[PDB]
Amino acid sequence: EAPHLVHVDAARALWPLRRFWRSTGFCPPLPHSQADQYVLSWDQQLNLAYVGAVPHRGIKQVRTHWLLELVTTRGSTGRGLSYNFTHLDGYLDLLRENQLLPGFELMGSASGHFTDFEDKQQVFEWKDLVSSLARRYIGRYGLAHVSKWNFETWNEPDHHDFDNVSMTMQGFLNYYDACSEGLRAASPALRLGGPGDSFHTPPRSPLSWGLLRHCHDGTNFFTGEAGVRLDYISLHRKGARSSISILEQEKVVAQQIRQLFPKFADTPIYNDEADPLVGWSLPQPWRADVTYAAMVVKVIAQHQNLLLANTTSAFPYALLSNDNAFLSYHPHPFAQRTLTARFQVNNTRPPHVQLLRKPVLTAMGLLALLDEEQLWAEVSQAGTVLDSNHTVGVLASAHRPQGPADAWRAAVLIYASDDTRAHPNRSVAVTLRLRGVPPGPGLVYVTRYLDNGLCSPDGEWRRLGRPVFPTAEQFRRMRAAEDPVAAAPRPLPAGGRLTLRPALRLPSLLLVHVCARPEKPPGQVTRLRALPLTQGQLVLVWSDEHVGSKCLWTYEIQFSQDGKAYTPVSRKPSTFNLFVFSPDTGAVSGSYRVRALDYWARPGPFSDPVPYLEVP
Numbered sequence: 001e002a003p004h005l006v007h008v009d010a011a012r013a014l015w016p017l018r019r020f021w022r023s024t025g026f027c028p029p030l031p032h033s034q035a036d037q038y039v040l041s042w043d044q045q046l047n048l049a050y051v052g053a054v055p056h057r058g059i060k061q062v063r064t065h066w067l068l069e070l071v072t073t074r075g076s077t078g079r080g081l082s083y084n085f086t087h088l089d090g091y092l093d094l095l096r097e098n099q100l101l102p103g104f105e106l107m108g109s110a111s112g113h114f115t116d117f118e119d120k121q122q123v124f125e126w127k128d129l130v131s132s133l134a135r136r137y138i139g140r141y142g143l144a145h146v147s148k149w150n151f152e153t154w155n156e157p158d159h160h161d162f163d164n165v166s167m168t169m170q171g172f173l174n175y176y177d178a179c180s181e182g183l184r185a186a187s188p189a190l191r192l193g194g195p196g197d198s199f200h201t202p203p204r205s206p207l208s209w210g211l212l213r214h215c216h217d218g219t220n221f222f223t224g225e226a227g228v229r230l231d232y233i234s235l236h237r238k239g240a241r242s243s244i245s246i247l248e249q250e251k252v253v254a255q256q257i258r259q260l261f262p263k264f265a266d267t268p269i270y271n272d273e274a275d276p277l278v279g280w281s282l283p284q285p286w287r288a289d290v291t292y293a294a295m296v297v298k299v300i301a302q303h304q305n306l307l308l309a310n311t312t313s314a315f316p317y318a319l320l321s322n323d324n325a326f327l328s329y330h331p332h333p334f335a336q337r338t339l340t341a342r343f344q345v346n347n348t349r350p351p352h353v354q355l356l357r358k359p360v361l362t363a364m365g366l367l368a369l370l371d372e373e374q375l376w377a378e379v380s381q382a383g384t385v386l387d388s389n390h391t392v393g394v395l396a397s398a399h400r401p402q403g404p405a406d407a408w409r410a411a412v413l414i415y416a417s418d419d420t421r422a423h424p425n426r427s428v429a430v431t432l433r434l435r436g437v438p439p440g441p442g443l444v445y446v447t448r449y450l451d452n453g454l455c456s457p458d459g460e461w462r463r464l465g466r467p468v469f470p471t472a473e474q475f476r477r478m479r480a481a482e483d484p485v486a487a488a489p490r491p492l493p494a495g496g497r498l499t500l501r502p503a504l505r506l507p508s509l510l511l512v513h514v515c516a517r518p519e520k521p522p523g524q525v526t527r528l529r530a531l532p533l534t535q536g537q538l539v540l541v542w543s544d545e546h547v548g549s550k551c552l553w554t555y556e557i558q559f560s561q562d563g564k565a566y567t568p569v570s571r572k573p574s575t576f577n578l579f580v581f582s583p584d585t586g587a588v589s590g591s592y593r594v595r596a597l598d599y600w601a602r603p604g605p606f607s608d609p610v611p612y613l614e615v616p
């Protein structure tokens with residue numbers, strides 16, 4: 001085996017790097033009218049804390065099915081229709097509380113009322129419903145916030161998942177017009193896209209091709225205008241276990257759109273379910289560990305280096321979402337396509353829920369450290385240059401600084417992944433040759449590493465015999481494998497060159513973070529919260545909105561029980577904005593506070609205290 005060479009020139013900022021992957025999503029179970037019980041459940045509350053605790057807004061939106069099953073109604077068409085938004089307010093406040101946006105799929109029946117989009121009585125009632133919504137949440141969150149949301153059509157229209165609603169090829173086009181004008185009526189600044197399906201070659205995917213034709217050439221059901229707003233085009237294409245085939249399928253579709261619809265040439269394209277394998281609930285061991293994490297990175301790596309960065313076609317790809325915010329079910333907590341592993345610990349009084357952070361979710365924290373400029377990189381084996389369409393690849397960024405709380409930064413993220421297949425008995429030798437690093441005050445570097453050996457709570461869980469209701473002790477042990485293995489800051493050598501020679505496993509991830517010293521220390525931690533889990537445990541979550549620099553070693557957390565002094569909580573070094581505090585003694589009632597610790601051992605200010613009192 002000739003080593004894998006990786007060259008990275010930090011002098012050459014080639015073009016901007018966009019964080020186009022910062023999305024997740026899910027679907028409530030049956031019955032859809034009870035979606036509010038799944039969605040406002042204490043489980044989902046913990047789930048979205050974990051989603052929003054990824055550093056530096058690493059996950060932004062949460063695309064959510066059946067949202068309009070959170071709206072109830074009263075009266076009727078002739079009598080006087082009135083909507084109840086209370087459950088929808090609950091879910092949207094919950095996203096807001098976790099600094100997350102909804103991928104607002106205009107999807108549902110308002111608890112029965114909507115039944116047929118060929119009935120024009122209803123097509124109008126829908127327009128006004130959408131307009132009511134928008135106006136209500138514009139008043140609630142401000143137009144600036146709501147204008148960020150991705151409003152979307154009903155999910156996968158060509159899969160007939162409409163429940164008991166008559167949505168014909170034509171009725172669907174009517175429904176769209178109601179949505180487009182319903183939003184228009186509230187504000188021309190809101191954004192609407194669709195259809196959210198496969199766009200198979202005709203006559204397959206009738207409604208997906210129909211809608212494009214409609215918005216491109218057809219008539220508005222309301223105004224009677226030529227063509228209709230189409231802010232973005234969303235497709236779903238999944239890999240069937242192949243990472244490159246996702247990208248290959250997207251080019252085929254895109255090319256068809258570019259030819260059949262000249263006006264849409266510059267229309268943004270999303271793949272808002274860009275998953276490795278269709279069927280989120282299917283047990284797959286590779287979904288449980290780093291094998292999935294790395295394959296996710298590998299996909300993003302291909303999209304950046306083979307599509308976005310530099311291409312003849314230069315298709316207008318704008319978003320990628322891995323649809324994996326689902327809560328998992330016994331008896332496969334880890335093996336489903338989820339960001340977190342759910343444990344329904346029923347044998348406590350009362351019963352409670354625990355979530356474990358899976359590697360895929362942590363890997364999104366490594367992607368989050370990527371900055372706004374893409375750096376020239378070349379991966380080669382023997383003499384031959386390898387693109388991202390290979391088991392080992394890389395993404396590297398630079399940060400052009402501005403303020404005195406900020407400085408130059410580079411992040412090199414190297415993946416080793418054979419998609420869904422692992423290779424436990426293999427070592428991949430790599431030689432990172434970083435060059436061109438510009439001079440700066442106190443240049444340090446930090447490595448963060450993931451593999452199944454060192455960083456897999458599933459592997460730990462399996463080692464402990466797969467307990468169905470782990471003990472507190474056992475949760476602490478599984479959680480010890482959540483964060484990557486982190487080497488402490490080592491000053492760079494002189495001359496501006498760094499050569500590391502790691503033996504990466506397969507699968508595995510390596511982030512090399514190189515940082516200049518900012519003049520000033522970190523900013524302050526905000527929005528500290530203490531959510532109870534069970535007697536003797538709680539979750540601490542908080543925001544890094546005003547923390548500033550990304551050159552962070554960890555968050556120091558301090559706890560003062562009774563009225564005694566504050567004491568540091570001993571824990572694994574983590575940039576993750578959430579921590580489960582499970583003291584072996586069980587003493588948790590007191591006050592907590594948190595602050596950032598940068599690579600130069602400089603603390604930011606402490607957060608406001610959060611008092612906690614356990615009520616048995």
Ligand SMILES: *[C@@H]1O[C@H](CO)[C@@H](O[C@@H]2O[C@H](CO)[C@@H](O[C@@H]3O[C@H](CO[C@H]4O[C@H](CO[C@H]5O[C@H](CO)[C@@H](O)[C@H](O)[C@@H]5O[C@H]5O[C@H](CO)[C@@H](O)[C@H](O)[C@@H]5O)[C@@H](O)[C@H](O[C@H]5O[C@H](CO)[C@@H](O)[C@H](O)[C@@H]5O[C@H]5O[C@H](CO)[C@@H](O)[C@H](O)[C@@H]5O)[C@@H]4O)[C@@H](O)[C@H](O[C@H]4O[C@H](CO)[C@@H](O)[C@H](O)[C@@H]4O[C@H]4O[C@H](CO)[C@@H](O)[C@H](O)[C@@H]4O)[C@@H]3O)[C@H](O)[C@H]2NC(C)=O)[C@H](O)[C@H]1NC(C)=O
Pocket residue numbers: 026027028029030031279280281329330331344345346468
């Ligand atoms: C500690 O306490 C906890 C309680 O707090 C306990 O937690 C419980 O654990 C149980 C298991 O241990 C859980 O049981 C399992 O539930 C799951 C999930 O059920 C929900 O969702 C189902 C799927 O919905 C998807 O699909 C539909 C349509 O296709 C969509 O409409 C949904 O939107 C959703 O779509 C997404 O997902 C699909 C993926 O499939 C994607 O393709 C889509 O694109 C979307 O992304 C849904 O079917 C369920 O609905 C049932 O129940 C409703 C009431 O809840 C009811 O209204 C529905 O009509 C339906 O009822 C019918 O079926 C159920 C059986 O589930 C019957 O009881 C009922 O009488 C009706 O016949 C629900 O909304 C579920 O997937 C599992 O079901 C499979 O496995 C069990 C075996 O245990 C079988 O009984 C089922 O037949 C089923 O089939 C299995 O076997 C098949 C053949 O071998 C195989 O093909 C399948 O792959 C599968 O393996 C379980 O039922 C329980 O959910 C959970 N409770 C809670 C609150 O979380 C915990 O157990 C306890 N711990 C311990 C250790 O004891």
Ligand SMILES: *[C@@H]1O[C@H](CO)[C@@H](O[C@@H]2O[C@H](CO)[C@@H](O)[C@H](O)[C@H]2NC(C)=O)[C@H](O)[C@H]1NC(C)=O
Pocket residue numbers: 244247248389
């Ligand atoms: C990525 O590399 C794979 C090889 O692993 C490519 O698939 C091969 O190349 C062409 C595709 O048109 C065909 O001859 C075969 O399907 C594959 N050949 C072999 C020998 O495996 C794939 O085309 C590459 N994808 C991209 C986007 O470059």
Ligand SMILES: *[C@@H]1O[C@H](CO)[C@@H](O)[C@H](O)[C@H]1NC(C)=O
Pocket residue numbers: 072084085086
């Ligand atoms: C909306 O529904 C909820 C739950 O059923 C209820 O508590 C609330 O009072 C309803 N809203 C109004 C305005 O009555």
Ligand SMILES: O=C(O)[C@@H]1O[C@@H](O)[C@H](O)[C@@H](O)[C@@H]1O
Pocket residue numbers: 026027065155156273275277278279280281323
């Ligand atoms: O792959 C899957 O399980 C499913 O794919 C799509 O059909 C659904 O819209 C998603 O809810 C889910 O991700």
Ligand SMILES: [Cl-]
Pocket residue numbers: 275276277278337
């Ligand atoms: Cl998947």
